[PDB]
Amino acid sequence: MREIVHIQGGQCGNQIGAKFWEVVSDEHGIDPTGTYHGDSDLQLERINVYFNEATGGRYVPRAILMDLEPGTMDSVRSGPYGQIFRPDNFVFGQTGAGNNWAKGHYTEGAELIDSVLDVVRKEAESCDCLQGFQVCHSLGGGTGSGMGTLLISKIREEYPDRMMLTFSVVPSPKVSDTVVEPYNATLSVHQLVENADECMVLDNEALYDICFRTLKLTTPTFGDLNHLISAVMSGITCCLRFPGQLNADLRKLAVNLIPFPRLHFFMVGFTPLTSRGSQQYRALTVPELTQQMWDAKNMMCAADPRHGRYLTASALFRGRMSTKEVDEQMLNVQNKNSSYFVEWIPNNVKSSVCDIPPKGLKMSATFIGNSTAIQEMFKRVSEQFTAMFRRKAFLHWYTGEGMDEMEFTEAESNMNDLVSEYQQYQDA
Amino acid sequence: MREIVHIQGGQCGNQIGAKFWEVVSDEHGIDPTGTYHGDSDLQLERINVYFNEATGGRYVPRAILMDLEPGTMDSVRSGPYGQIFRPDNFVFGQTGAGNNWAKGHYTEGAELIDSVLDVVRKEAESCDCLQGFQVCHSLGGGTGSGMGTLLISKIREEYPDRMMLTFSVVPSPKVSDTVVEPYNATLSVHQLVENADECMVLDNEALYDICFRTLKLTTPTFGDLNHLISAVMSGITCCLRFPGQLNADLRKLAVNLIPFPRLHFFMVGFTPLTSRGSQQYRALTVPELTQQMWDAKNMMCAADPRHGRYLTASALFRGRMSTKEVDEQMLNVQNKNSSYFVEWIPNNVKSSVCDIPPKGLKMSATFIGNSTAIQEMFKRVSEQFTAMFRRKAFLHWYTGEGMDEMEFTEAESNMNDLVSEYQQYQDA
Amino acid sequence: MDLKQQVKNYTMTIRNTRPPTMIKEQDKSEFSHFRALQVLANGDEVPYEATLRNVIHDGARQPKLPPRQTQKHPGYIRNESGGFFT
Amino acid sequence: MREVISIHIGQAGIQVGNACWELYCLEHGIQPDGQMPDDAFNTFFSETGAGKHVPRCIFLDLEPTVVDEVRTGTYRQLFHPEQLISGKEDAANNFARGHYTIGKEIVDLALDRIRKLADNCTGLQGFLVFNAVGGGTGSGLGSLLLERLSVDYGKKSKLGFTVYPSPQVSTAVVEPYNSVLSTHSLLEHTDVAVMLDNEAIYDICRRSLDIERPTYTNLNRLIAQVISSLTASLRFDGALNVDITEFQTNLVPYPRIHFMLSSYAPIISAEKAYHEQLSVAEITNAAFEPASMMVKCDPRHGKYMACCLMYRGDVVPKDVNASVATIKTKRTIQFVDWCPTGFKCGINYQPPTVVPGGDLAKVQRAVCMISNSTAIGEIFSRLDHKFDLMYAKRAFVHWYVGEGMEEGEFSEAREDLAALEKDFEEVG
Amino acid sequence: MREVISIHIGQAGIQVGNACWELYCLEHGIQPDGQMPDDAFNTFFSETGAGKHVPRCIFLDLEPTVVDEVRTGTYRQLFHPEQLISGKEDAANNFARGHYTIGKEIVDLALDRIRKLADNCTGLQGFLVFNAVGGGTGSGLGSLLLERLSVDYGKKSKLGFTVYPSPQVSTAVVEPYNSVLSTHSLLEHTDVAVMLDNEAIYDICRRSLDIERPTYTNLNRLIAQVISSLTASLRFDGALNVDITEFQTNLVPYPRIHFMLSSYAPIISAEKAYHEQLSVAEITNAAFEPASMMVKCDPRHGKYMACCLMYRGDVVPKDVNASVATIKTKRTIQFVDWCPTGFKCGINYQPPTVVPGGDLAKVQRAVCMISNSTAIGEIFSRLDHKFDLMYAKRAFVHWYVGEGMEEGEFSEAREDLAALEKDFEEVG
Ligand SMILES: CC(=O)O[C@H]1C(=O)[C@@]2(C)[C@H]([C@H](OC(=O)c3ccccc3)[C@]3(O)C[C@H](OC(=O)[C@H](O)[C@@H](NC(=O)c4ccccc4)c4ccccc4)C(C)=C1C3(C)C)[C@]1(OC(C)=O)CO[C@@H]1C[C@@H]2O
Ligand SMILES: CC(=O)O[C@H]1C(=O)[C@@]2(C)[C@H]([C@H](OC(=O)c3ccccc3)[C@]3(O)C[C@H](OC(=O)[C@H](O)[C@@H](NC(=O)c4ccccc4)c4ccccc4)C(C)=C1C3(C)C)[C@]1(OC(C)=O)CO[C@@H]1C[C@@H]2O
Ligand SMILES: Nc1nc2c(ncn2[C@@H]2O[C@H](COP(=O)(O)OP(=O)(O)OP(=O)(O)O)[C@@H](O)[C@H]2O)c(=O)[nH]1
Ligand SMILES: Nc1nc2c(ncn2[C@@H]2O[C@H](COP(=O)(O)OP(=O)(O)OP(=O)(O)O)[C@@H](O)[C@H]2O)c(=O)[nH]1
Ligand SMILES: Nc1nc2c(ncn2[C@@H]2O[C@H](COP(=O)(O)OP(=O)(O)O)[C@@H](O)[C@H]2O)c(=O)[nH]1
Ligand SMILES: Nc1nc2c(ncn2[C@@H]2O[C@H](COP(=O)(O)OP(=O)(O)O)[C@@H](O)[C@H]2O)c(=O)[nH]1
Ligand SMILES: [Mg+2]
Ligand SMILES: [Mg+2]
């Protein structure tokens, strides 16, 4: 039960999905051939949440791979873990996205959704009790933003009761690999707020620092960044997969984190994170894991917590430990930094716990926080957008797809309305 | 409980701590691999004061090593016991010191304090009952004086209740390895008086004589000087580390030694000390240990106690003995040279003892005294300060970092008041 | 509750009605192993795998995570008043 | 003739049950495989046609992830699978999802399991609920169930051991919401309801047994001891045998006031058991200790409307008469005027049985104190506070109104508490 | 029936407690493991449910180091760890730290242990205090304790064996301060007070036993012999038995004058013992010798207000009244006019015991003397001078007023020292 279907949009989303499916395939101990070669029974009790059975004792992922320009889909097929995907779980088109949110969401998106919806419906019905969805965006490119939102809007009006996640990678405030990037960001946000339930936001810039300071990596390639997104994405669901003294389904994480329907942009962090040297000296206890997670550096988003207060947070532990320690740790933190939380919320952390740790480790944890610090991120973009929209730069591409200007003005105002709500509950 | 955090500032401070953390590491019988290989339980009973636990039964020192110009931190890390330090406990900056107190305390200070303070708190919480801080200085240089005083001020404003010891090495009256030496000295003394509780002042000159006459050393390297400071620094805390029929915490030494908040400048010395030859003649008895420490040579600071007067004093013995001997010994000295002591204090000495001797030795002692003869040092430095300040020598360097002339005037006045205080209670 | 769980419960009911007979969940060549050992006792020439016998049990799931040690060093933490933990 | 039906709703409920039904099979020699090698077990079992003893319990839950653990644990041979109920989806900490949308569709199932279980019992003493307030299942469903029970029986007695949301330690952000809603509905249905919380038991393991790493499994063993000593007279002999009817008539003077605290003594490890004698006077004093309670309430802030004592092991009736006389003499303990009596005691001759791998030690004496005190209204005032502290912001209310509820129930659950709070003040 | 509660505060208290409880367990056949291979021990022990005998003592301290030694010493199988109390931090010879700041938060633990220790006794003779005046724990806490004791019982008798700051030998520098603050605060609460000084006993070791290596152990040995001879009547047979009630009333004429000296005889090694026959007279002569006292107080400068002699071993009452008549005829002794009597003598039939590896020798006769004299004001006068000698300078005061004290207490305690001294003059 609680099965979950997984979607990957855009190039990046298709790439981190290659790791998420490679990390999990090793967790439950299956092979690149799709055969199981683990040892315990916990590898099999809740395997159905991530896989469908196959003939001959194979396991294939409940994944969908959507992206134009099928060149990328040859890559993931050629990776060491491409042989587990059903080669008909591949929807694509020869034409490019071009980073134009419009065509990704108006012209070339409308040509594929009828096929994608055919595929997601097919394996939405392959689940006994479908828990929810989850995607992998990239708010910069046109595939991720344009196709992702159009897909999401379709799912929402078809599966209203279910829940939609989003591991959207936000653009960088300092770095802009593209130029029309703020146009793709704001236009997507005008869709997510009303058409999602939980939306993690992640930025590669913070992923570079974490790999630089903590991990002491010299050359963090995109794999390592993807290796981190994979790590957390597995940490969210170990309750659904493994036994736990206090299990946390995704719907109970929702209700404990979003007091208002619109404040569903989260802030994520993983722990423990050390180099190979520090691994020898540091000891793995609940104290280490909670001070590291409550640090302002582990936040993979380009937002400073100290500029805001946690409306609510939540920590997920996995590893044989004592529940009392994690119960008082979240208490002390709630006491000392009383300025970093709110008053109308008496206890604003939830401390779930699982019984089975990661593969080679013995204790681990994951931090999720709904702080008002994220309002900074949207503030920034809302300038770069209103900077060029004041000059109508690059806008002719967007009128080239039957769009108008009202679409932007409505979209921008939606964020200014949103970030306004993050200020109301931040009484400084 | 009573866990103590250690600091090492400057070149010298980073260098003596290499010995200090080498001596103690062999006292408690742990290896350069960080694991314990002693014989008794006692090395484990109060091991918590100097170390933290680790995976695989390892013990890492609770020390913080801070210095610009990270060249020397390679030396200790290449030292035979550099493998035990947590490599996250290495704060350094590439830009040199420049022997300028300002940049060591105004521009380059602010760049590293935020980093250091993250470190000091990261293991200040690791202590169940933090006894106090302790730090190894060098008032001549720019890192030692500048950074430490800046660092000391910050510590005092978050741990005001605790005690701040200080093993600062003083500039020499006759030798000046540098030129601008008095400037950094006064600018540090203007900070030490207000943000410290106990300040041991030591000078390598007397360290040279004690190496020359008693130990009969032909060529003393800096490793031998630091070998001495390691001994006395390991001689203070035998009470917090080992049993004793009369133990002495630091806080009771402080109350028993400074009757006034500003007379916290001390004077130390070790006992016994002998070459290999006379060690085959000499006998180890408590009369031996007390005359050698009461003498006016062993005083590591370049001051003559006979010119001043002992306000307070103390003696810390280690080794199985009869404490009445120690009791009557200290009584004799208070009688014979009755002019080196004060009147309004009936008994101005404290006689401690520990039941645990040194590693290879069996009896040893340590001296400490708060005499007014120490004001001789602040007299000397005041001359060197006023001579150049009269002509504003090397002064543009200091103004080059936003500094002004008032800070020199008050720093001068504060020593003048200080040395004035040591005169009042010195009624000759 | 549902079809899948009712089938599950019926199979579990069968498992409980049947005696588990402390079974070993794998049976190798019992009498062949005995015969090969008797051949070794006197004839002194038997294949190695013929001499061998293999038996497995369930053991457990949960593949030997290392111990948590449940306890610090008795020099750091004290009970409420000075006193070890047990 | 004298049997009880033990229900276990929610995760904590069935967790504690995994300890109670662990203790009982050992108290009566029942092997984990259903069968041992009269009336000593009928209260908690029912011998089958031949050999096996099934525990007359019900394990109910909406999260499959924990019931399926008993389904594969060592204690599967005990339970017939028709007992262990599960569900494809859970309540996710929403009272409405537990009480309105999901819970409505499985009560008819369990109600038939009960009807198939009450008929086997000849003399039905009463039900035995294990609610865990603070979740969706325990609160929403458990309350929906008890409504369906009182319409069937009414005259029967419905007990309850409800873990309450602790003031300081709390692992939910919305649990002040559901807690109020649960009490507003269970109060007029149940007739007696024991209350307790986690942290009050966390400390007891630190004070008395001195285990620095208590987990949910440790607290569960202590809840097992409370019930065994409570229900022993239902299954064992002894002077002053106590039955639920005679346990209930003389402890709830008013219909609304039925909540009460609990306590237990002695609580000591093995080593502390050899340096003692454990006189009946010691235990009754330890039992009356406000620190030995299982709820974070201050009894000295109120009086005792009534009290009750179930001793165990080697006792004689005169000493209880003597010890209770000593208690009525002290001044720290108060009693309201309209109750001159207030001690309905009881003995059994069967000692408490310890479980291998348990934290307690073997004792030939034990006391379980239950008392209805007007001091308990303070902890109701906390939930009285936090509710309006958040309902003022209407936080999380979109979940409840979105799940078959409205604002009316909140306001209507509100008034009942203020009315209940004044009732605790009308007794003075 | 007849029991005493021995308390040990500070370092010296838990030091001598190691000696006395070594002596008793030796005298009564108690093995270190609780059990022995009635009422002979009930005065000092509580036979458990089977075999073990727990000593009815209590060890208090703020320095963990010493109470930790007993925990690892051989006598860990004797003390219920509930008895051995410690503290994370010490008092560091500051009265306020042991009295105002740290003492307050732990007495609730001690009185808890004491309440658990008095209820076990059916007839409580009185408390037995082993204080150490001159430190922060002994003086600060001990005084804070006695107030908590007298507010509790009052009717109970409080007896105190306190070590007093010796005038010549002075291991501290500030000990006049807290001693002054102690004597004032304790006086109105203790019913009797015995004071002893280490320096005197040191001289005793020299003349009689002839040990030029006297340690704190040997001194602690002798106190054990004194108290063992005192409690001898309480726990043994013998003509003219003495109990604390009648003992105290025939020794304290005025409520304020309860300060008394002590003496013991014979005190002889194993060689001088062979060349001697030990008649009662010479023992009583030595017991009245001012040198054989344990205080540096000369009784020949005042009068004896009363006196009490506790013999041991083979004595007949006719030898007693003969030897005492040899004293009251002597001129070197002086008594006050308003008492023709003044000798409360006691005999016991059990000889003194000797400790293997100890310093005493086997003797069949033994006498201890306790006298109340007005001459004690002499050593009280020294502390009067030393206080103002440093209070005019206000030395060390910034500690006290910083540790939760004021300047009144210095003046307030000052007057009662004057007040007491005049009272010792009004009896002339
Ligand atoms: C001797 C030893 O313990 O080696 C460790 C190790 O030293 C460290 C440094 C590992 C190591 O990780 C890295 O070196 C690394 C490099 C780039 C980016 C991220 C990590 C390790 O690779 C990671 C690896 O951890 C795992 O396998 C986790 O269970 C992790 N696995 C994967 O992500 C994975 C997936 C597919 C193939 C290979 C690895 C995981 C995390 C969450 C959920 C599921 C799995 C292990 C134990 C180690 C090494 C090998 C050095 C660390 O990683 C994790 C997630 O454990 C880096 O910080 C941790 C701390 C570990 O101590
Ligand atoms: C056969 C024998 O007895 O040899 C002695 C020895 O003869 C003498 C000369 C030693 C020796 O010390 C020196 O030669 C020396 C050289 C430069 C500076 C200081 C000392 C010795 O090295 C020193 C060493 O002392 C210790 O081990 C102490 O416990 C000391 N340990 C260290 O300094 C140390 C050495 C190596 C690695 C780590 C630490 C100590 C001091 C304070 C606190 C804790 C420990 C011992 C007994 C000896 C030798 C080897 C000759 C002396 O030093 C000490 C520290 O005891 C020098 O004066 C004393 C008198 C000793 O008798
Ligand atoms: N004493 C004790 N308390 C527990 C235990 N497990 C959980 N709790 C507490 O019970 C409360 C939640 O219980 P749950 O059963 O998980 O909640 P629920 O009723 O199932 O509602 P949903 O989570 O929506 O399904 C929390 O406060 C837990 O801390 C346990 O094993 N022992
Ligand atoms: N005769 C004798 N005197 C002792 C012994 N131990 C300590 N003393 C004396 O006790 C005095 C010190 O008292 P402490 O108990 O250490 O002071 P404190 O009250 O505990 O305050 P802190 O030191 O802060 O803990 C010293 O003068 C010792 O001479 C002993 O074993 N025998
Ligand atoms: N973690 C990670 N991020 C990537 C990677 N490749 C691209 N990104 C980011 O994803 C954005 C581009 O999105 P993309 O899918 O390539 O364009 P689209 O096809 O129009 O949606 C850019 O901001 C890239 O920096 C990768 O390999 N790993
Ligand atoms: N005991 C000892 N003192 C040293 C040593 N090396 C340098 N010192 C003193 O340290 C002084 C300069 O301090 P330094 O740390 O180099 O300057 P900074 O980096 O600006 O703080 C010099 O006057 C040296 O005499 C050493 O190895 N042992
Ligand atoms: Mg639940
Ligand atoms: Mg002390």
UniProtKB/TrEMBL annotation, chain C:
Annotated region described as Disordered, given as residue ranges: 57-86
Protein name: Uncharacterized protein
Organism field: Chlamydomonas reinhardtii (Chlamydomonas smithii)
